Amino acid sequence: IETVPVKLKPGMDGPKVKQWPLTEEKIKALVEICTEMEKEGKISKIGPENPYNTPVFAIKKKDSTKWRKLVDFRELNKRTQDFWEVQLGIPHPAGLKKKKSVTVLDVGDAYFSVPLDEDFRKYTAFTIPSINNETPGIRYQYNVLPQGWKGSPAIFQSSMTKILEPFKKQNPDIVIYQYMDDLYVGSDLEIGQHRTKIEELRQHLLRWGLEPPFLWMGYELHPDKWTVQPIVLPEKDSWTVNDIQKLVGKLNWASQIYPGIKVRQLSKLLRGTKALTEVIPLTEEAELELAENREILKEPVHGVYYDPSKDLIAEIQKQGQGQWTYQIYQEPFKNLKTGKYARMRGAHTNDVKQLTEAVQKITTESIVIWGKTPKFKLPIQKETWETWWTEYWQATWIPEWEFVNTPPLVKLWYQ
Amino acid sequence: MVPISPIETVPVKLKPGMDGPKVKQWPLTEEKIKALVEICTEMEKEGKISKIGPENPYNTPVFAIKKKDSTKWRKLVDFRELNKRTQDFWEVQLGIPHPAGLKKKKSVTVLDVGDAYFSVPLDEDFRKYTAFTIPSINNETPGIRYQYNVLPQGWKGSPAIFQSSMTKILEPFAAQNPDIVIYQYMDDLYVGSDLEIGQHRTKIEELRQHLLRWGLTTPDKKHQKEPPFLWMGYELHPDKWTVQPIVLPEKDSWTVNDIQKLVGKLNWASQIYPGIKVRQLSKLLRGTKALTEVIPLTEEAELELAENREILKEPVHGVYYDPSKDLIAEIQKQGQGQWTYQIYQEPFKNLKTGKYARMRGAHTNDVKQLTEAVQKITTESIVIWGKTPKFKLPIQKETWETWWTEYWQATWIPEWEFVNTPPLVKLWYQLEKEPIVGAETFYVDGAANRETKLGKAGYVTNKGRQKVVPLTNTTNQKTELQAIYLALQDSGLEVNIVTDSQYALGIIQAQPDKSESELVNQIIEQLIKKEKVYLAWVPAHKGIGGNEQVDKLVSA
Ligand SMILES: Cc1cc(/C=C/C#N)cc(C)c1Nc1ccnc(Nc2ccc(C#N)cc2)n1
Ligand SMILES: OC1NC=Nc2cccc(F)c21
Numbered sequence: 001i002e003t004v005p006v007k008l009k010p011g012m013d014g015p016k017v018k019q020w021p022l023t024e025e026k027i028k029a030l031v032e033i034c035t036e037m038e039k040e041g042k043i044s045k046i047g048p049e050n051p052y053n054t055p056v057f058a059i060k061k062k063d064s065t066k067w068r069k070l071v072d073f074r075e076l077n078k079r080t081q082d083f084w085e086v087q088l089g090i091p092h093p094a095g096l097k098k099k100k101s102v103t104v105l106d107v108g109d110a111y112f113s114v115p116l117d118e119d120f121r122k123y124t125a126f127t128i129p130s131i132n133n134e135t136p137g138i139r140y141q142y143n144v145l146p147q148g149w150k151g152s153p154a155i156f157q158s159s160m161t162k163i164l165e166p167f168k169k170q171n172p173d174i175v176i177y178q179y180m181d182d183l184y185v186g187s188d189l190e191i192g193q194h195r196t197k198i199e200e201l202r203q204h205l206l207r208w209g210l211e212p213p214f215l216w217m218g219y220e221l222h223p224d225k226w227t228v229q230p231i232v233l234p235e236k237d238s239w240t241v242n243d244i245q246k247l248v249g250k251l252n253w254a255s256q257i258y259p260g261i262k263v264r265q266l267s268k269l270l271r272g273t274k275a276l277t278e279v280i281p282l283t284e285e286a287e288l289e290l291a292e293n294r295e296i297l298k299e300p301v302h303g304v305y306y307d308p309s310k311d312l313i314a315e316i317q318k319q320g321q322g323q324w325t326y327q328i329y330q331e332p333f334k335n336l337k338t339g340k341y342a343r344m345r346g347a348h349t350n351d352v353k354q355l356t357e358a359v360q361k362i363t364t365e366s367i368v369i370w371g372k373t374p375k376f377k378l379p380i381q382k383e384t385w386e387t388w389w390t391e392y393w394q395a396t397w398i399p400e401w402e403f404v405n406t407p408p409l410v411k412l413w414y415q
Numbered sequence: 416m417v418p419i420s421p422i423e424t425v426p427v428k429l430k431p432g433m434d435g436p437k438v439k440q441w442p443l444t445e446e447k448i449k450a451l452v453e454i455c456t457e458m459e460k461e462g463k464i465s466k467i468g469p470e471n472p473y474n475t476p477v478f479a480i481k482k483k484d485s486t487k488w489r490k491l492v493d494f495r496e497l498n499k500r501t502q503d504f505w506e507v508q509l510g511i512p513h514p515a516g517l518k519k520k521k522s523v524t525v526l527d528v529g530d531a532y533f534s535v536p537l538d539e540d541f542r543k544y545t546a547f548t549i550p551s552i553n554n555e556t557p558g559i560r561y562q563y564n565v566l567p568q569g570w571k572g573s574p575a576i577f578q579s580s581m582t583k584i585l586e587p588f589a590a591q592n593p594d595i596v597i598y599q600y601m602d603d604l605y606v607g608s609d610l611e612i613g614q615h616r617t618k619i620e621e622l623r624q625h626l627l628r629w630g631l632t633t634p635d636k637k638h639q640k641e642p643p644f645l646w647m648g649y650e651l652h653p654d655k656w657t658v659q660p661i662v663l664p665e666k667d668s669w670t671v672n673d674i675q676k677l678v679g680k681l682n683w684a685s686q687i688y689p690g691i692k693v694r695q696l697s698k699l700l701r702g703t704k705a706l707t708e709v710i711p712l713t714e715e716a717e718l719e720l721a722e723n724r725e726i727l728k729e730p731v732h733g734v735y736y737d738p739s740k741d742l743i744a745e746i747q748k749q750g751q752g753q754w755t756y757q758i759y760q761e762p763f764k765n766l767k768t769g770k771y772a773r774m775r776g777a778h779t780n781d782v783k784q785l786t787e788a789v790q791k792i793t794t795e796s797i798v799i800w801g802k803t804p805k806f807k808l809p810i811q812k813e814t815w816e817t818w819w820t821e822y823w824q825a826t827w828i829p830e831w832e833f834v835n836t837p838p839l840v841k842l843w844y845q846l847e848k849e850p851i852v853g854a855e856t857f858y859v860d861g862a863a864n865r866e867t868k869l870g871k872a873g874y875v876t877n878k879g880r881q882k883v884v885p886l887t888n889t890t891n892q893k894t895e896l897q898a899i900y901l902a903l904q905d906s907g908l909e910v911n912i913v914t915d916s917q918y919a920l921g922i923i924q925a926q927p928d929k930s931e932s933e934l935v936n937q938i939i940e941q942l943i944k945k946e947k948v949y950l951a952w953v954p955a956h957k958g959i960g961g962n963e964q965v966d967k968l969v970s971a
């Protein structure tokens with residue numbers, strides 16, 4: 001009810017980010033949403049003495065028909081002071097990734113009950129554009145904690161802990177982790193039990209609230225079943241020259257990750273200048289070397305540790321037929337997680353929609369495991385991604401990304 | 416008197432840490448001083464400026480400029496220094512409407528709102544920074560000191576604050592009259608509708624009456640400006656639009672500057688004249704910016720210019736947007752990285768046209784360029800109309816499917832249909848997914864000495880076919896490409912090629928059909944002639960038969 005003082009980082013002005021082009025349906029949705037927010041006091045119109053701007057668009061969350069306003073506060077979040085005053089940080093719960101069900105709640109509507117520091121509000125300015133710039137863009141700023149801003153969970157944290165005390169005391173084995181506008185609630189109960197505890201939890205926030213438009217939803221995950229991708233080599237009875245070449249190439253790559261990998265004896269099978277399709281019998285020396293390599297590859301990579309002070313990097317490869325591989329790492333060749341998708345939803349003839357869904361799933365995994373989002377290296381031309389990703393986005397956060405323009409040879413090794 | 420509502424002031428600040436201007440007033444002639452004193456007395460009578468005491472420490476210089484061919488002087492207060500120190504503002508005019516996104520209107524009336532400008536008060540706490548001094552006659556008394564009470568012409572914040580103040584005044588009128596449009600440009604309001612003229616003129620009078628609520632008077636003797644409007648380089652008419660006349664000069668010899676001006680005109684023209692091209696003429700501007708340097712026009716530039724003159728021989732107009740109809744965008748390949756497009760709703764009635772040029776880069780292909788053009792038109796269309804057009808593209812559906820399913824990147828083009836108008840975009844080659852049974856296998860390699868730039872490229876095959884070629888003035892990368900070229904030259908229609916060059920694989924896996932490297936282009940021409948090609952990569956220096964032998968032959 002009283003505002004927490006907020007500042008930008010030293011020697012740092014507010015965001016001045018261009019609003020990107022919006023479709024007619026998104027503009028009309030935003031006009032309707034913002035007219036109601038304004039009536040409710042959450043936002044107010046601003047004048048030309050506020051030169052700041054942050055982009056806005058609109059999404060439909062997974063399984064809903066109602067538009068949600070999404071502000072892209074990535075720039076404001078970079079420029080906002082860090083929040084360690086009451087707590088150096090919320091030590092990330094390593095047990096969340098171990099639960100049999102984790103449900104993700106959109107709780108961001110709660111933030112609107114806390115006023116934003118009057119001196120910081122100008123920095124949350126945003127614009128609803130008009131088609132063809134025929135009328136002046138509608139300019140607003142927030143009067144309350146905005147969804148998507150990194151300060152909002154920080155400032156609301158005291159209020160959230162208090163709302164949740166009764167549920168936590170009564171259900172002590174539940175893991176509850178907050179990330180931006182999401183609440184992650186992990187249990188090891190039967191899903192019907194689980195859903196009921198989730199609904200129990202909603203009521204505490206409905207109760208406190210006295211309506212939240214997306215609180216009723218639930219994104220159900222199951223991280224104990226999350227799969228990884230170790231390095232595996234083919235098991236064959238007939239090896240062609242080409243097969244052995246590909247094997248030697250894969251093993252050479254793997255030897256950058258794993259010390260003791262050897263290819264001497266396998267390379268020796270190819271002596272001469274043979275046709276690619278010719279079948280080569282493995283010698284005993286080569287079968288032994290291969291077996292030794294297989295055994296090395298069953299072990300974990302050496303010297304792999306997470307440093308919370310370093311960025312997480314996520315790489316994605318398109319494998320075809322709807323399949324995507326990915327790796328999350330901080331240092332080259334020291335993967336912290338690898339994985340693979342294929343279940344790409346309602347996107348069989350759309351690569352970009354599939355990639356956008358993969359980016360969201362990887363980010364979700366990253367949040368659950370380390371409590372932060374990775375920086376993506378995306379296999380797509382910048383202009384294609386920027387034109388389309390907002391059409392498929394369903395999450396209330398947005399990670400950072402860069403673009404890969406040269407085809408990586410290593411895609412082959414993750415197939 | 417009738418009370419009027421005040422116009423809310425915008426609070427204004429100087430940039431952090433800066434103070435107001437303290438700029439010396441230049442000496443003026445006795446003649447200019449008398450003129451400024453009379454001018455400012457009138458401005459003061461009208462409430463625009465007020466005299467101030469000597470405490471105010473700020474100053475901005477004032478000038479007197481003779482309005483040409485008149486005995487009347489005009490005052491100029493030079494706010495350059497205050498502007499450097501004034502905060503930045505939100506500028507709403509950054510995006511200007513494109514005519515092709517406008518809607519047809521039966522009537523458009525203009526209203527002069529120049530007098531309103533001076534009903535807009537300046538933030539009381541900022542006025543002190545606008546102080547200026549008329550020097551005294553003979554410098555024998557203190558100069559007369561004034562500050563502004565209204566938005567000064569030439570001050571940084573005046574356009575943004577005037578527009579935002581007028582928009583706020585206009586908002587309830589527009590909201591409650593959804594059957595008109597209102598647009599502010601300079602000191603004029605443009606009001607458009609589809610109403611019968613009597614109702615339309617009624618709305619205009621009602622608007623004049625709304626404006627009076629703030630004491631804002633508009634001239635009775637209605638505006639002289641009438642359709643067609645000359646606005647931002649366009650001509651707007653009630654039911655069509657075009658660019659203002661495009662006249663390409665005749666010239667016996669061309670300067671850098673002339674060619675820059677020519678290309679700018681062509682670019683402007685290309686939004687409604689279909690087919691405009693500027694590649695060859697822009698090529699002439701490469702690198703140099705000596706504005707007076709003469710450049711001979713290539714024969715290719717002369718043909719491009721001649722083709723453009725023909726396109727521009729007679730007027731072309733665009734139609735306005737009908738939201739009840741779909742938007743269609745059709746694209747053609749023009750050659751040399753150039754693409755042209757038309758956006759229409761009814762056949763043969765374009766809303767607008769435009770062009771797209773290949774991005775600078777080492778290697779490229781037509782499918783990528785077409786995709787980029789689609790992505791550009793899509794974004795332009797979202798800006799102008801708020802929706803993606805349906806596309807008509809010169810690429811077969813099966814070609815696109817083969818491309819995107821096998822391309823290493825994610826890629827997508829929105830709803831489209833094939834239009835069979837040459838030249839068609841096609842896939843010139845496609846590499847095999849598996850080694851070819853029965854096709855000879857070429858193990859290729861090259862190497863170069865970094866100091867002497869001498870090198871070798873060659874191959875050895877499973878049939879004992881071998882070649883090594885000595886090369887001069889070369890590099891490891893070039894020799895690695897030369898080796899693949901040799902294998903393609905000397906093989907039959909089906910071939911397996913084994914390379915250890917990550918560089919060459921990176922290029923070939925990008926699937927170029929044209930390159931800045933003539934060696935890559937030679938490789939592409941060979942690939943086009945094959946029936947099947949499988950390219951296999953192996954790590955260098957690993958004892959891999961075939962690879963090891965050729966590496967030995969070429970590194971010697
Ligand atoms: C952007 C704009 C510039 C001018 C005028 C600028 C200046 N000078 C005048 C108006 C009224 C507008 N605003 C809009 C908005 C929607 N449709 C239209 N269509 C429209 C406008 C003018 C003519 C005509 N003749 C025909 C149709 N204009
Ligand atoms: O940029 C322009 N704006 C308006 N009219 C023009 C006429 C010729 C060239 C040109 F660049 C322009």
Ligand SMILES: [Mg+2]
Pocket residue numbers: 860861862915955956966
């Ligand atoms: Mg070599």
